Amino acid sequence: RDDWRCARSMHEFSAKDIDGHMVNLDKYRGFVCIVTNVASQXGKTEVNYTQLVDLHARYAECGLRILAFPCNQFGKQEPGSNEEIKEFAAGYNVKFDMFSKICVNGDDAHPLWKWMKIQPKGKGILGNAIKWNFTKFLIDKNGCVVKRYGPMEEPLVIEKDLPHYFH
Ligand SMILES: [Cl-]
Ligand SMILES: [Cl-]
């Protein structure tokens, strides 16, 4: 239903993918997901893309999925078009799911991001707003937020928190 104020799961939202196609996020029902805001011109771009690609390579077979949302709200570090961003991600051998560029803060924020930020495990250390590029949310198979990791936490720190069976 796309209403951040009433939704109980990620699975109630839709989002436009980087190719311009609407995706119902209920396709992720049953899968553990990392949802993250990305940028191409951030100091931590390289380590985030490389480690997200590595996590996906090793855990896709267990059901790990990664949803990457480009966002230009942090130092204008995602200025390119969706087609440019798709090409950029392809240079990292990204095989996870790239979305069209969004806002993550303010009234124009994508509803999924409004929702994630208010979940009990979606709070940041110093409040809910997304602070910079490459915040990550871990989402369980039921579409609930389990943990949040900030811009300074490289993606491999999430590895520890994946289900034991993955390992
Ligand atoms: Cl996948
Ligand atoms: Cl914070």
Numbering used by the authors: 5 to 171
Provide the publication's sentences verbatim.
The isoform GPX4 belongs to a subfamily of selenium-containing GPX enzymes and is unique in that it can also reduce hydroperoxides in complex lipids such as phospho­lipids, cholesterol and cholesteryl ester hydroperoxides, even when they are inserted into biomembranes or lipoproteins. The catalytic mechanism of the GPX reaction involves redox shuttling of this selenocysteine between the redox states selenol (Se–H) and selenenic acid (Se–OH). The catalytic site of GPX enzymes was initially suggested to consist of a catalytic triad formed by a selenocysteine, a glutamine and a tryptophan residue. This was later extended by a conserved asparagine to form a catalytic tetrad, which in human GPX4 consists of Sec46, Gln81, Trp136 and Asn137. Recently, GPX4 has been identified as a key player in ferroptosis, a non-apoptotic cell death resulting from the iron-dependent accumulation of lipid reactive-oxygen species.
In order to produce the true wild-type protein, we employed a novel approach, first described by Eaton et al., in which wild-type GPX4 was co-expressed with selenocysteine insertion sequence-binding protein 2 (SBP2) in mammalian cells on a 10–30 l scale. The protein was purified and crystallized, and the crystal structure of the wild-type form of GPX4 was determined at 1.0 Å resolution. The structure was solved by molecular replacement. In the refined structure, the active-site selenocysteine residue Sec46 was clearly defined in the electron-density map, but the difference density maps showed a strong peak at the Se atom. Reducing the occupancy of the Se atom to 0.60 removed most of the difference density. The reduced occupancy of the Se atom in the structure may therefore be owing to radiation damage, aggravated by the long exposure time that was required to achieve sufficient completeness in space group P1. At the very high resolution obtained here, many side chains needed to be modeled in alternative conformations. Additionally, one of the histidine residues of the C-terminal hexahistidine tag could be built in the electron-density maps. The apo wild-type GPX4 structure described here is very similar to previously reported mutant GPX4 structures. In the wild-type apo GPX4 structure reported here, there is only very weak difference density on the Se atom, which did not justify modeling it as an oxidized form. This difference in oxidation may be related to the tenfold higher concentration of the reducing reagent TCEP used in our study.
